[PDB]
Structures are given as structure tokens and as C-alpha cells.
Amino acid sequence: SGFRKMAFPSGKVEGCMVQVTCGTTTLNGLWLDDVVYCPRHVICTSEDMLNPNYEDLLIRKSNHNFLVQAGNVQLRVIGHSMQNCVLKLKVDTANPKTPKYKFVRIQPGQTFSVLACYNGSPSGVYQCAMRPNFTIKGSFLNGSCGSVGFNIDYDCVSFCYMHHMELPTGVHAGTDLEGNFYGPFVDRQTAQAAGTDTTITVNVLAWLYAAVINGDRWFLNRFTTTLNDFNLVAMKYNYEPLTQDHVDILGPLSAQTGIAVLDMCASLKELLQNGMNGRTILGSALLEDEFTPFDVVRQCSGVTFQ
Amino acid sequence: SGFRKMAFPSGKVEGCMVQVTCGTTTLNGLWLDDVVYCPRHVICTSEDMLNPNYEDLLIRKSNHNFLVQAGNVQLRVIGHSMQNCVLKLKVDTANPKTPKYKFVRIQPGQTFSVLACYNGSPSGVYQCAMRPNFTIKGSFLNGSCGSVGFNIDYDCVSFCYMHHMELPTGVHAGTDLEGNFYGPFVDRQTAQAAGTDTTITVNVLAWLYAAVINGDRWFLNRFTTTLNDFNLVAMKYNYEPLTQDHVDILGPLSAQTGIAVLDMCASLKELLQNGMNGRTILGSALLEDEFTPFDVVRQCSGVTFQ
Numbered sequence: 085s086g087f088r089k090m091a092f093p094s095g096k097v098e099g100c101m102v103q104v105t106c107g108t109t110t111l112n113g114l115w116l117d118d119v120v121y122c123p124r125h126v127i128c129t130s131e132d133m134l135n136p137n138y139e140d141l142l143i144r145k146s147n148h149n150f151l152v153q154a155g156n157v158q159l160r161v162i163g164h165s166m167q168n169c170v171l172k173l174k175v176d177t178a179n180p181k182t183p184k185y186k187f188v189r190i191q192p193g194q195t196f197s198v199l200a201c202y203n204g205s206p207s208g209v210y211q212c213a214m215r216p217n218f219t220i221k222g223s224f225l226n227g228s229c230g231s232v233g234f235n236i237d238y239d240c241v242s243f244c245y246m247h248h249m250e251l252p253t254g255v256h257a258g259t260d261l262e263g264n265f266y267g268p269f270v271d272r273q274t275a276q277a278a279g280t281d282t283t284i285t286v287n288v289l290a291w292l293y294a295a296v297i298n299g300d301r302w303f304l305n306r307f308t309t310t311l312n313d314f315n316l317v318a319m320k321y322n323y324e325p326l327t328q329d330h331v332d333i334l335g336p337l338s339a340q341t342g343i344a345v346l347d348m349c350a351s352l353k354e355l356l357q358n359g360m361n362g363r364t365i366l367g368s369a370l371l372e373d374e375f376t377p378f379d380v381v382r383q384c385s386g387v388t389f390q
Numbered sequence: 391s392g393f394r395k396m397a398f399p400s401g402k403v404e405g406c407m408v409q410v411t412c413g414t415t416t417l418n419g420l421w422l423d424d425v426v427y428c429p430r431h432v433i434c435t436s437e438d439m440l441n442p443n444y445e446d447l448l449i450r451k452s453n454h455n456f457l458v459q460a461g462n463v464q465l466r467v468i469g470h471s472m473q474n475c476v477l478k479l480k481v482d483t484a485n486p487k488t489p490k491y492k493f494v495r496i497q498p499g500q501t502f503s504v505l506a507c508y509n510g511s512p513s514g515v516y517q518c519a520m521r522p523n524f525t526i527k528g529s530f531l532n533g534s535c536g537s538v539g540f541n542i543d544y545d546c547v548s549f550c551y552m553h554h555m556e557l558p559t560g561v562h563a564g565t566d567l568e569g570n571f572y573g574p575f576v577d578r579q580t581a582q583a584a585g586t587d588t589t590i591t592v593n594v595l596a597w598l599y600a601a602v603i604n605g606d607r608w609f610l611n612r613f614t615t616t617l618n619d620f621n622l623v624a625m626k627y628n629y630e631p632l633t634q635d636h637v638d639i640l641g642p643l644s645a646q647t648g649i650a651v652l653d654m655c656a657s658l659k660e661l662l663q664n665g666m667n668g669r670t671i672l673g674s675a676l677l678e679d680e681f682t683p684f685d686v687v688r689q690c691s692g693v694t695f696q
């Protein structure tokens with residue numbers, strides 16, 4: 085028992101992390117087979133990063149302008165190209181540590197692990213959710229650009245995120261690994277801002293089921309509610325609508341605890357109208373929304389990865 | 391910016407994790423050079439685990455009774471011995487993935503990363519603190535025994551914890567890697583229980599400094615307090631005393647934010663007497679005590695490991 089924000093073991097990703105330097109800009113790259121992936125703004129200068137024409141900037145570059153360090157070993161760049169907002173640096177050595185991998189794009193509400201890196205060196209690992217407004221509430225300092233987010237499915241790494249920039253509220257924006265930004269953000273210095281967020285309702289319900297599995301029951305009740313009536317309360321509290329498919333996805337957790345999904349909706353209703361009255365749930369005094377139903381089942385059942 | 395519960399990259403530990411089976415008991419072992427370390431209760435049966443004489447149980451065992459699987463490769467056991475509450479299984483192959491390492495024992499109030507494992511396969515990584523009552527609030531299911539906790543210092547892994555058991559409140563107890571239990575717990579089935587805990591005051595102050603670094607300032611004030619007067623409030627709220635050495639350790643964070651340590655104590659005082667009045671700090675509605683001053687400086691400055 086117990087319930088923690090759990091990341092995937094990071095080893096398979098650590099073996100892919102490299103340092104990419106262009107001019108005076110150093111950031112992180114992701115090295116798979118014979119290609120290094122990194123944010124294309126590596127080729128921009130201070131004044132470039134205002135309003136740049138990336139095609140123009142790249143044609144002025146040569147292979148030898150890109151310095152790639154795999155630990156203390158230098159990788160020779162033999163080709164370069166742009167794909168949307170990422171660069172693809174062709175190197176003359178395939179990474180012997182390349183795991184089985186995929187490039188997937190995730191949905192807001194889903195989670196992933198982040199391996200924060202600086203100068204190609206892994207610093208720490210933590211779990212994030214893609215917010216409904218397509219930002220992530222990460223932990224990133226200067227030089228973290230190119231750090232990646234990922235999930236692990238048995239032995240296969242699904243890369244879903246590469247870090248690009250911090251927004252003025254301190255939240256973070258990035259792309260999938262085909263270089264397509266999550267949300268309405270661009271790799272230019274504009275006045276872009278996050279835009280309004282909501283709470284991931286299905287995840288909050290999953291987390292209440294984690295609590296019940298772990299012995300927190302004070303918020304349960306005998307009342308029930310309809311889906312339509314619950315969603316009227318969700319709207320008034322900036323929670324997003326609950327679908328029948330969310331209800332179906334919560335089926336297994338429902339069946340394990342014996343608490344009907346709409347019953348737990350009734351409990352969430354009361355928590356929203358009454359607050360928590362000085363009590364806690366799974367060591368939180370807030371309703372937590374960054375665990376998916378998948379995350380609860382994995383942790384409250386115990387699936388591994390090899 | 392941003393502040394997350396961050397674990398160390400787990401790769402160096404993942405390469406050491408193995409499966410140890412004795413009879414019908416399977417748990418995890420830690421494989422370094424030619425020795426596998428694991429909880430000695432692996433040699434106990436159901437009825438053994440009531441009140442066992444471990445010396446008696448071990449003399450009845452042979453090398454071939456211990457099955458060790460390093461992934462899909464079987465390691466031949468060539469020697470076995472007890473050291474306090476751990477077994478040391480001598481195998482005929484030195485682990486080629488052995489990192490530079492140390493066996494350290496940590497202090498309550500300090501943090502470490504846990505690589506939760508099942509059947510020798512890494513499942514997930516997360517950050518824990520050693521509680522003042524020598525328990526950890528982990529996330530562990532059946533078969534996690536032998537999972538380890540660790541810190542990373544440049545390239546050196548300091549192992550500080552091996553998991554043994556869950557206590558009736560759902561918290562967790564274990565040993566250092568010389569097999570000496572943290573706190574007054576034994577690897578027998580007794581009515582042992584955690585015993586009263588307190589809040590790690592210096593860590594809460596460190597976390598308030600993380601908040602100020604990250605733009606949360608609503609809890610600051612102009613008042614100050616003396617150390618003696620702060621500690622009178624700490625006692626009334628089950629917070630442990632603050633020492634001059636805690637004040638000294640908070641010096642750098644103080645100097646970076648320009649908020650005197652005793653000033654921040656005054657702020658913590660008010661938070662304890664008034665609560666948080668529907669506001670949050672670093673996305674928490676509770677005063678958080680599982681980040682050391684070291685953790686805040688590492689994350690709010692950006693140190694890596696290689």
C-alpha cells in the first residue's frame with residue numbers, strides 16, 4: 085500500500101541523452117540509432133530568437149557547426165535537417181543503447197515521466213500530466229531544453245514530449261517528437277500565455293478510488309447522482325465534463341472497491357461544495373488530478389517493465 | 391522554474407536489480423560485484439515468519455536452495471552468509487554494470503529515491519523522506535521486498551535503504567545495506583507499530599524558500615521572531631525543534647531570497663496559527679516537509695549527475 089507520484093525507471097532514456105552545441109547555445113538532444121533530435125531553436129542567437137526564419141537560419145549552417153557530445157565521446161554529424169520544430173542531426177554512429185521505442189503524441193489529461201537534463205547529463209526524473217490547456221507544470225531551469233517526456237510499456241519507450249520553453253506563469257511548453265507543439269505555442273519570443281485551464285475530472289475520480297483502496301473512506305456517502313446532474317456541478321467548479329467513456333474506463337476500479345462510479349461522483353460533488361473540512365486524502369489537502377485510471381491500477385496492482 | 395518531487399535518475403540502480411528465490415518466496419536482490427544482497431526473511435516460510443531463529447534456519451540451507459535470476463540469465467550461488475538482517479549471496483559472476491557505490495546510513499529528515507521492484511524488474515521510481523519515527527511513507531505491494539533507496543553524488547550511488555515490511559498504518563520499514571533496521575522494528579511478525587511522528591521543521595522552511603524562489607510570496611510578513619519563541623510554537627504543533635545548525639544550513643537560501651531565517655520562522659508561525667485560508671503554496675494546501683535544504687538548492691539551481 086501507499087500512493088506516490090511515481091515515474092517510470094529512467095535508465096533506458098538516460099542512455100540516449102547527449103549534449104548538442106551550436107554557436108554559444110548548448111542544450112540536450114535525444115540520440116536514437118544514428119539520429120540526434122533536439123529543439124530547432126538551438127540554431128538561434130539572442131537577436132535571432134525574436135522573430136526568426138528558421139529555414140533561412142538553417143541553410144546558413146553546416147554539419148561542422150553542430151557539436152554533439154555523448155558523454156565524453158564526440159559524435160560526428162554527417163547530415164542535418166528540419167522537421168517542424170525539431171532538428172534531426174545525422175551522426176556516423178548508431179547509439180548501441182537505443183531501446184525499442186515509439187514516437188507517440190499524448191492527450192491532455194494523460195501522464196508521462198520527464199527526465200530533466202542539463203548539458204546532456206540526466207539530473208532527475210518526475211511525473212507530469214499534459215494539462216487541458218496543453219501546458220505541463222514541470223521543473224525546468226536554463227539548459228533543460230531538449231529534455232524528453234516518455235512512458236514505458238513492457239520494454240518499449242513511447243516518447244511523447246520534448247521540452248522547449250517556459251511561459252510567463254512558470255509552466256512549460258514543448259512538442260511531440262515529430263516537432264509539433266502541444267497547444268498554441270511557437271518557438272519564438274512573443275507574448276504567448278497559457279490560457280485558461282480546467283481540472284481533469286476523470287483523474288480526480290481515479291485518485292479517490294486510489295484513496296479508498298488505501299483506506300481513506302471519510303468522503304464516501306450513501307447518496308448517488310446522475311451523470312447530467314454531476315456535470316452541472318463540474319461546470320460550476322471549472323471541472324471538465326465526465327463522459328460515459330470515462331465512466332466505462334473507471335469500471336475496474338469501481339468493481340474492485342464496490343463503489344459505483346456515479347456514487348463516487350456524488351462524493352466528489354460534496355467535496356466541491358463543502359471542501360475537505362481540515363481532513364486529507366492520500367496525504368493531500370487538495371483534490372488531485374494528475375493520476376490517470378491507468379496510473380492508479382498500475383500502482384495499486386503492481387505492473388513492472390523490462 | 392517549477393518545483394516537483396524529483397527522484398534521481400534510476401539507471402545505475404536498475405542495472406543491479408535481480409530476482410532471488412528461496413523455496414516459494416521470491417523477492418528482490420541487489421547485485422554488486424560478485425554479491426547479491428537481499429532481506430534475510432527470504433529463507434522463512436509462512437509459519438517460520440512467526441518467531442524464527444534465523445541462524446537455525448540458515449544452517450539448514452545450501453547454496454543450491456538460492457535461485458538468482460539476472461534478467462533471463464541465472465547466476466550460480468557459490469557462498470551464502472548472514473549480516474544482521476540481510477543475506478549476502480556470493481555468486482560466480484561479478485556484475486559488469488556495478489556502479490561506483492557506497493553503503494551509507496541516513497538520518498531522519500533526509501530524503502532518498504526508491505526504485506520499486508517486483509521479481510527483479512524495476513517498476514517505478516519516487517522520492518521518500520526518512521520520517522522522524524524511522525518509517526518511510528512509501529508505495530510498496532507484495533513482492534517489493536528488497537527494493538532499495540539511494541542517492542546519487544556525481545557518479546557514485548549511496549545506497550541507504552532496503553525495503554523489508556509494511557506496518558499496520560500502511561507505512562514502511564527497512565534496513566540500511568548493512569542489514570541494520572531503521573528504528574525499533576524487527577523482521578518478525580509481531581504487533582510492532584510506527585509510534586508517534588513529528589513534522590520536519592527545517593524541511594518546511596526550505597520548502598517555503600523554494601516557494602519564494604518560485605514566486606509564491608503571500609505568506610511573507612514584516613514580523614520577526616526569536617529562535618526560542620519560534621520553538622515554543624513548533625512544540626505546540628508537533629513540529630520538531632529548530633537548531634542553530636538548521637539556521638546555518640538555511641543560510642544560502644536565506645541569502646538568495648533576502649529573507650532572514652528567523653523572518654521565515656515568523657511566517658511559518660502565522661501559517662501554523664492561521665492555516666492557509668484557502669490558498670496554496672507550490673501547488674500544495676499543506677505545509678510540506680519532505681524536501682531538504684539540499685533538495686531545494688539542487689532543484690532551484692540545477693545540479694546533474696554523471
Ligand SMILES: *[C@@H](F)C(=O)N(c1cncc(Cl)c1)c1cccc(-c2cccc(Cl)c2)c1
Nearest residue numbers: 224225226227228229248249250271272391
Ligand atoms: C533551453 F535553452 C532552455 O531550457 N530554456 C528554458 C526552458 N525551460 C525553463 C527555463 Cl527557465 C529555460 C530556454 C532558455 C532561453 C530561451 C528559451 C526560449 C525562448 C523562446 C522560445 C523558445 Cl522555443 C525557447 C528557452
Ligand SMILES: *[C@@H](F)C(=O)N(c1cncc(Cl)c1)c1cccc(-c2cccc(Cl)c2)c1
Nearest residue numbers: 085530531532533534535554555556577578
Ligand atoms: C516481500 F515479501 C514484501 O515486499 N512484503 C511487502 C512489503 N511491503 C508492502 C507489502 Cl503490502 C508487502 C512482505 C510480504 C509478506 C510478509 C512480509 C513481512 C512480514 C513480517 C516481517 C517482515 Cl521483515 C516481512 C513482507
